[PDB]
Design a protein around this ligand. Sequence first.
Ligand SMILES: *[C@@H]1O[C@H](CO)[C@@H](O)[C@H](O)[C@H]1NC(C)=O
Lengths: 535, 530
Amino acid sequence: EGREDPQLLVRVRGGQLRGIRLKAPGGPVSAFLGIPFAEPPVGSRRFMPPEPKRPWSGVLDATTFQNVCYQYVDTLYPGFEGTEMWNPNRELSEDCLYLNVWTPYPRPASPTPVLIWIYGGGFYSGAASLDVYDGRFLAQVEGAVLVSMNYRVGTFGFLALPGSREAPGNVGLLDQRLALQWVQENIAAFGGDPMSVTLFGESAGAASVGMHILSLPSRSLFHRAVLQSGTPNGPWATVSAGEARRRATLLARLVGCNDTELIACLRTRPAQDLVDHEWHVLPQESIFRFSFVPVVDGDFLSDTPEALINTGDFQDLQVLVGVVKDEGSYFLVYGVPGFSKDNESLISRAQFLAGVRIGVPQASDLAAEAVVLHYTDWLHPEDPTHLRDAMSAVVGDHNVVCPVAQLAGRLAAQGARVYAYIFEHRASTLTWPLWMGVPHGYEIEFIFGLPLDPSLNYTTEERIFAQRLMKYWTNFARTGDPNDPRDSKSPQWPPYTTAAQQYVSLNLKPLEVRRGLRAQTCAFWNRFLPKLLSA
Amino acid sequence: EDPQLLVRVRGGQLRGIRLKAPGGPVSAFLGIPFAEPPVGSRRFMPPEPKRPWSGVLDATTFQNVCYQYVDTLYPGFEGTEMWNPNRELSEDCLYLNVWTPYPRPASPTPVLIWIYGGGFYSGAASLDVYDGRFLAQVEGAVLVSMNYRVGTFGFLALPGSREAPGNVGLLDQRLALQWVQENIAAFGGDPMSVTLFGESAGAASVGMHILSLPSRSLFHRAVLQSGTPNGPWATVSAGEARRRATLLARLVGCNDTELIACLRTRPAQDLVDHEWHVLPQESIFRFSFVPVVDGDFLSDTPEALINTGDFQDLQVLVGVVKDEGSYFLVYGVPGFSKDNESLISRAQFLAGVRIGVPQASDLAAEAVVLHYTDWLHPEDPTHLRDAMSAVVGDHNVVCPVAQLAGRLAAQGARVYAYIFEHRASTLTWPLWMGVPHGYEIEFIFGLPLDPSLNYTTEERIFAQRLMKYWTNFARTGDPNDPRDSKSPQWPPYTTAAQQYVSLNLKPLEVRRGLRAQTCAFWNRFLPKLL
Ligand SMILES: *[C@@H]1O[C@H](CO)[C@@H](O)[C@H](O)[C@H]1NC(C)=O
């Protein structure tokens, strides 16, 4: 070593890392970026569980983000900040199982609460390196240890021939889990308290957090959990073994291919080749069509999440959950005819019924009838502004809001401490049109503290809001309670209960309590609609 | 011999009585025969015109009430007795009543004809709440009301037979309307301006006259208060009527001809004894004998008929009251009584729904419960109680009334719609019933103007106001006072804007959408779910 900054050399079980002292608005942080936690899942290892990373010699350079797992790159709007902000920001490669650690500078003296981020991307995309997941502000301003991992997405992470040796399913979730294991063993080397790990994530990342709550080997690797705009239960986060087998077989044919032979063929296919076909598995017109998601394999998920959230014991569990004001708006522009980022997307009634078939592809004619009926404003059943907004609500309520409301309800009942929010602040910087409101995913930059970077052009009040939110999330990591134990001028955030159904609004104003999470409407999706899908 | 109380009608001479109304005298011709008594071989049969009479017939008193079940659920309770027959029961009952201003109108006066409700199993023109004296006096209206046959006597059909063709109670009504075309001028009435009005089954009857072509030439406007020809309760299929008829016959020990001949031989009270055993089906509206879709009087189900009809030259006033369903709960639904607050359990509510919507399959019941549950207070007994009322009101009245108002407007009528929200200070039902089925009639008819009745001074003004709405509609097709610039004007109900008004103590408020979402549930979804 000799001449290096002594505050930036740490040792983990695999060997020696050298980190980087990064600059944050109000001081420096330590970052150890691109630490490998698994043997690269390439060649013969494709589709297979991750193996722990064999120790290296010398000092690993952990100063830059690593490769991003092979994924489909969105090209709906070339040059558009609104979409590129989510696109990969490092080389694409199957060699991508690396995690990142942010800690205070100097790394803290007493052992600090850890926060682990699991990114979203509908299980087909995502990266711990994206700007909106920068751990530096949470590290610097809250003295938090923050960790985030890459996990395999799309076919590489989730294609399954359930029952087989070669492609058991859920390997993306298993990548995440091995990263949690890595945290237990090694986080202390950085001043992290492995007895205080809160998982947080958004969308498919939230669903991931939910599945760890639901999977036994993984329950011993964290204590608290945050699910933002996602759930393990619901229409898009899982597939039955049979369905997953159908899709895997189908994809195999598309690329030109006894389970051993099939997968052996698949494995001889170039990565890009699989990515080029992963969308053709469901011609089936469908927004939250994505073919490769966690399979209910009777192993990792011993049963469907709905079953498991109904009958598990969550007495020893604190969750924070919530949604943004406009969950579904975003999705409409990706294959509901009539919707665009470039006009005000006022649709016709005809375009609405047509969208309801696309948003709820698993719906009989009677079901679509029901949805349309429930979401039509009969005072103005022809008004395009309302219909546009209805279509958003439908997609939003079906995939996010009511799955979350269900999740909060069951959990609260089965003995958990649940806190619930609705995020209501549209970013002054947002580049999506006004009509989309506060779209899915646009709370992340606030929780991570991005508005504290003067150069990012957020308003002052947004900088105060960011800090407020960050306090909520870290307090929750620390105590299982978002409220401040000291400061009692600020309105309290009450637990969500079955009886009172209370949640709070997150916006530029002080906390306001509300009761019932889209109560009537979620009763429609969660209780009534299923029964209408008995033929 | 007051010559003002003396009239020559086509059948002969009549002598009325002079009646005392608060602000002056009214002429009155009670108990005028409009048909041959429908007795003996004439039971179940179409009414025939009454034969002429020698001398001066005494029309100074109310005639008999048509033979009907008498309510005994709450004996001696004012709430219930006021609906019960207030004269002798008899199958000889086809009489009508005319009220006119005294002295009798100097030029032809618009005529209002009342058709009482009672679910097609009860009711009388002679009840206190249909007293035509105030409308006659205060508004100078010629007001007519008739008895028509009810229950088995009026509605028992063996469709296609010559000897019990069905709908005779409606034909009774039609004949009274014919009688008015032919005789009302003699009272100062204008046969060129006949407005029908009725409540509940009287509303449905009014509606059936709208839908039946011979009736159409006998009136010019209509008011349907809290009832419709469409809906669950007002009509039956030819098939189902024949079933209920033969079942009633079998129940009293009885070929169409031979079956009816046998029924004809039975005392009236025998048929009424078994009237309520034709549908054991523990619903509320288990009344078995209602107008029948006969391909004759009703050329096709009302739904069909309102859907395809042409209502170009028609003005209609329709409305509901705030709490259509509360009244009925205490008759069938377990857990509901006039004597407590009827705060019910959830289980009670789900059982309540299978009763209030007896049509409902498991799923459709699920749907109703689902729709009406307040998922934020899903157990609160106050909500479940109020929900139950709502289920029953909406399904049988509010949504039918909306369905009709929409279709009439769409197909060219001119529609005015209200909701009645004022609870009579003198009501004797408990508070949890709100403003129940039937409790606007007393205001329309002008009862609070009679000081001996203890209605608040505000209520007396409110009644004057409603009497103006109704008679303005009668006079013009428009309820609005044409010497009232200052407004709140009452807007026509159009399918586009969907406006109605609140009838209560505060001045008119225009609201849009008569239970818009809930009635979409009843009218568009639930049908498909079956
Ligand atoms: C906006 O753009 C979409 C997508 O190309 C188009 O189909 C739609 O007609 C446009 N909306 C309107 C009506 O301006």
